[PDB]
Design a protein around this ligand. Structure first.
Ligand SMILES: Nc1ncnc2c1ncn2[C@@H]1O[C@H](CO)[C@@H](O)[C@H]1O
Ligand SMILES: Nc1ncnc2c1ncn2[C@@H]1O[C@H](CO)[C@@H](O)[C@H]1O
Ligand SMILES: Nc1ncnc2c1ncn2[C@@H]1O[C@H](CO)[C@@H](O)[C@H]1O
Ligand SMILES: Nc1ncnc2c1ncn2[C@@H]1O[C@H](CO)[C@@H](O)[C@H]1O
Ligand SMILES: [K+]
Ligand SMILES: [K+]
Ligand SMILES: [K+]
Ligand SMILES: [K+]
Ligand SMILES: [K+]
Ligand SMILES: [K+]
Ligand SMILES: [K+]
Ligand SMILES: [K+]
Ligand SMILES: [Mg+2]
Ligand SMILES: [Mg+2]
Ligand SMILES: [Mg+2]
Ligand SMILES: [Mg+2]
Ligand SMILES: [Mg+2]
Ligand SMILES: [Mg+2]
Ligand SMILES: [Mg+2]
Ligand SMILES: [Mg+2]
Lengths: 381, 381, 381, 381
């Protein structure tokens, strides 16, 4: 009584879906470096030996897709056929067209920037919670940090048997204080990570407990009853796109709040700011974080929605879980007085023409690195 | 005060992401018709003139991928280059391998069926709400029905200018009664639908209001202040994969609860029952619907999670929004007494080897057609 | 006694192999329009709904591959799914990389143009015969003209049931005068041409005899014993890449001399002048035609060969079939005194940086249009 | 005076065009092992990290394309990303359809086997020459043996720095005796072969002269004036499909007579016996070799041609270069009395349903291994 379990997951940089997200954002950044107004909707698919780029780009940039893609795969760490994938020798296929003129004319052609229409219809959510300093659920924060630690240990040579493809999952036991949530302990941790053929299972499991989990999880959350599922499959030599097809926008919950809050369904990666799936979700996080860091609530969910070609949101909704003294209608009035959620204004407030998107494409878009949507707005009311 | 807006969206059968979901499930069904134990993880990508199949299948079935894919595209209604895509003449590319042996050995090889391991780690949610007879949010129910009506009118020749690619979005104004939600009115409707070159915009907008919206939305929810954004882009001749790349599992919120409840991130389409992203999400809906139709609550969210190779769930969580007299811990005990959420048991309870998955792949997986996960379990406690 | 049969074939513009040749040369021309020194090795593959570009290009040009490819397919006449292929709606996939640096450094980097090395090893032949004014075998000349007539009648609407995919084959009865050949009559003609579903076979066969064959073949060569195989398959509705995969460089005998003379194996299309498969074969035709039009022989075959990185030919050989009063060694001395067969000199003599290559890619590279290799050199000796 | 040069080339097993030929024939053999009447027209394209299969197959066989393709690449020796290509990790894409019904009905449906129609129109040549025991030109025989020696030394570890991609070219000085040709000496040899990064150029050139050339070329043909172009590019580390796109049927002169004789343009690899490009070219070699080994001539060229759907050849022509006492018309009568060149009879005489085609796909189809078309027919006249 009083307590509940909640589970979130994360994946590593070499997870095949995350490879695609990073590639799509490497392509977007490559365009934005030359043409800040590039319209980009780049999807990536990865399978054994293949990166395929599909989608719509209208840009003045001259982009060497072979170079951009292969350098992103190189950074991930897939550089030899022994690892199952190699940037030097894989197939890069490109099926990219111009943005449809019907779309262009409906959304941005001949518009003043501040009044550009939403690039599509859709709904988007932002969330924030005071349970961590990052204003993110602990479950997802820990899941991400476990994967980041694996990559650190791989890249510094502490654990040279590690590969790039990894998944993690953290279940935390919580209690609730008046609609806010308070983490008590880590209940279960799962880690699966691709490895070389020479390392034995007990060495891997020992290292994952001692060098990864204990290096990442605050000791106050771990106890003798914590359940560890470390390399639970027994063997994970084949990995990366060879083991499992990857697509852009197939880790949208990993990218956001790990099951907490809500999601409107739109992927982030490979999309420029006129795609409100990305710009308005970023803005909504910025709103949610601003409400919490401003002391107006402890936990909050923000919904916004759009129609293609229409610049203002169709709806805005605030849910505070009972964690404010203000009514949800009062918070909504405060949001409406302080934020302009048109895509052509968000772009200016969050500096969304800057080529920083590849950095967002692993370890979550929120809760790290003081990106502009992570810097709270000082609210007037 | 008292009221809030909530928005959900749906897409039609010819939306490019939904084309991929249907194709992936057409491939899964084709395998299951010959081999009930087929292991299938089929991703589809669609772009101008191309369907590519990527992923992992181990099966005794002999499947003609050209036929399966082209017949699915035919059923959708893409049968002429005038529509932007044609089943007769498009490229079908196949990049399908066996399931990795490391995965096979970790999950199912040499196991008794009831004890097969989860096919992957992950988290999943089920939701139900008493606001409609289907136990689904009204916003998403209406969004789906609008798209189904467009397809009906297209296929019966009432509106021969319609094409297969459509999107809809419904914003409802709600009030809340003790954690349950009560729809009051439709606030905003968006409809975008691909059309022929000859029909003018006013004829389209008139037909969408009179023949679609008024045929679908109960008149009590529509009033003089309802906002209509009908063909808001102005022109939507290019559509289907020519206008926008499609991928499997890029409509996961449309597939489920339209933003309500929560989502764990896993796509459904192209996956057999050992993939708990599908089987355990279906089971969780079945749990949630059983709790509501059993009179134990008005609204409920269920989380479950798994580790690869481990048959029992790692966590189960019940959230009732305050709509039960029973505590969440009591509901959890009732769930645990009445359901066995191992994938190898769910498969038997929900008959998940049957080739009915193509039917799930448009208009939502939940709230329609009395699929087995939509038939409440009589609970003992 | 005294007489022999000889057969050659040609194909139309919409034959799938010829589609690829035209596309590859459309890509080469697109580069050369912006960058005269572009290094291009572009292979094309065509199958139902797909054009794939594969190969190596290093160029300063910015080329819109989608536009270039689709416009070439448009010119061919594949513009509706009813025809089996449509430029508007097919898949264009691009798998193009830079020229390998090892190759670049071996062949052209840091060289004076006149001394660039051959771009590869290989052997090449040129041929000419005085039997026609074009200095080409009659069999191949007639085969080409039959296909050109089909395209004319298709494009002017005389025969609107015609499609773009066609093949023709002509067998001529010859006699020999002292190593020269003298055509006597057409023995057999084959024509297969893709057609619409509505035209009946007898109408097609009547039109092919009356409007095609009689419009093209000089009446002196046709007689009552000439054999006609017109639509010999009975039905040819499915055609173009839907019926048969196409690749660049799979019509190399159609491109040259129809079985007469000899061939060294190198394709022409998609290659810039540093590829001696194209430049030295063109030069060798130019030599052969110059010998014949200069009155030094009636019929002649020229072989040249190269090594990668080496500018001068490794061998030059002249075969006159007994049709000269000069010995083959004397003709060789005349060739060596009058031509410089280094690729960096040929490029200047034949103006091979000019973007005229798409025009070469159907109906043969030789015997038509007064291209520079078809204008005889005045010989000094 | 009296003498002439002639040049031919060959390529190794790992040359990218030859990789495609071998793969296409590996696919054909895989079908024929299960279904002797399989209709196969399989084209392969190779580029960095990619094997794509395109074409038309109608067969009762169940063929695992991933396995067939990857095993062929393995046999070639591309097994690590250090070599530029790896069977374990490359992309295999499949775009294979059924044979068009229009073609099937025109050629073979409902026909007695002996009377099946030619699978296409086309012309084909056979050649034989008494200059070697294999009845092949010395230039091409030597070119092939040089590549076979490189592969031997690579596979036995004598030269571990060798890779699979190689090209060779041999120029021989000949004299002519009454239309026959008599080799006098090797004039020039070119060898280019892919190599590891660690071996220096002088070590490679020394080994190519001493361990390859001197092991293959009879010493009587080599002298102090022979020209050697060994690794003439200077550096050949990048090779295989990474360096140069490969397609099936782009080595048709290497496959046949190295420039001698003539060629009708049809590729061999990936085609079953109903494709007369392969069956009738094999038959024509068999005719030519039978004439020479029967003492009827020293050197001979045979042309045959076909129409789609027509079983008998449209033309047969014999050219003896003046090397027979019999007239060409008498040789033709002897051929017509002794051979039945219908595809449905050739299949029986040459046993063309047997899965031996992968063995034909490198080092030439003729002049080796006592294949049935290399075993002379005893002629009656
Ligand atoms: N043998 C394995 N054990 C555990 N996880 C794996 C294994 N192979 C792949 N995975 C992970 O799970 C995902 C789905 O198969 C892959 O993307 C990969 O990250
Ligand atoms: N011109 C248009 N107007 C409105 N919606 C469109 C248009 N073109 C495409 N869409 C829809 O929006 C999605 C994203 O571009 C497409 O999948 C399609 O369903
Ligand atoms: N039904 C048919 N009849 C005759 N020729 C055809 C037919 N279908 C295709 N072809 C031609 O022959 C080639 C090989 O199938 C094709 O490229 C096409 O040009
Ligand atoms: N650096 C090189 N030097 C010599 N030959 C090469 C080189 N790179 C590729 N080749 C060969 O020549 C062909 C055309 O580039 C390739 O298929 C390969 O066999
Ligand atoms: K969202
Ligand atoms: K997958
Ligand atoms: K879920
Ligand atoms: K998209
Ligand atoms: K040639
Ligand atoms: K073909
Ligand atoms: K031939
Ligand atoms: K090539
Ligand atoms: Mg995935
Ligand atoms: Mg969306
Ligand atoms: Mg989408
Ligand atoms: Mg998942
Ligand atoms: Mg062909
Ligand atoms: Mg060549
Ligand atoms: Mg080649
Ligand atoms: Mg042919």
């Amino acid at each position: 009584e009083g307590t509940f379990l909640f589970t979130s997951e994360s994946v590593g940089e070499g997870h095949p879906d995350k490879i695609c997200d990073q590639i799509s954002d490497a392509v977007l950044d490559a365009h934005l470096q030359q043409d800040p107004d590039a319209k980009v909707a780049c999807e990536t698919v990865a399978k054994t030996g293949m990166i395929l780029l599909a989608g719509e780009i209208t840009s003045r940039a001259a982009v060497d897709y072979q170079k951009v893609v292969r350098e992103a795969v190189k950074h991930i760490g897939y550089d030899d056929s022994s690892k199952g994938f190699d940037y030097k020798t894989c197939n890069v296929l490109v099926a990219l067209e111009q943005q449809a003129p019907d779309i262009a004319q409906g959304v941005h052609l001949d518009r003043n920037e501040e009044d550009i229409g939403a690039g599509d219809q859709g709904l988007m959510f932002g969330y924030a919670t005071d349970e961590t300093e990052e204003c993110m659920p602990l479950t997802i924060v820990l899941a991400h940090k476990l994967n980041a630690k694996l990559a650190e240990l791989r890249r510094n040579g502490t654990l040279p048997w590690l590969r790039p493809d990894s998944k993690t999952q953290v279940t935390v036991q919580y209690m609730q204080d008046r609609g806010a949530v308070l983490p008590i302990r880590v209940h279960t941790i799962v880690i699966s990570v691709q490895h070389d053929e020479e390392v034995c299972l007990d060495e891997m499991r020992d290292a994952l407990k001692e060098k990864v989990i204990k290096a990442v999880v605050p000791a106050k959350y771990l106890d003798e009853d914590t359940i560890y599922h470390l390399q639970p499959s027994g063997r994970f030599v084949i990995g990366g796109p060879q083991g499992d097809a990857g697509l852009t926008g197939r880790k949208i919950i990993v990218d956001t709040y790990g099951g907490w809050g809500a999601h409107g369904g739109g992927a982030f990666s490979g999309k420029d700011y006129t795609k409100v799936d990305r710009s308005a979700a970023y803005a909504a996080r910025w709103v949610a974080k601003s409400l919490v860091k401003g002391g107006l609530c402890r936990r909050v969910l923000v919904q916004v929605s759009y129609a293609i070609g229409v610049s203002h949101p169709l709806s805005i909704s605030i849910f505070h879980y009972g964690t404010s003294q203000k009514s949800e209608r009062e918070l909504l009035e405060i949001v409406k007085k302080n934020f302009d959620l048109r895509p052509g204004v968000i772009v200016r407030d969050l500096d969304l023409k800057k080529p920083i998107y590849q950095r967002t494409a692993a370890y979550g878009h929120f809760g790290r690195d003081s990106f502009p949507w992570e810097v709270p707005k000082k609210l007037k009311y």
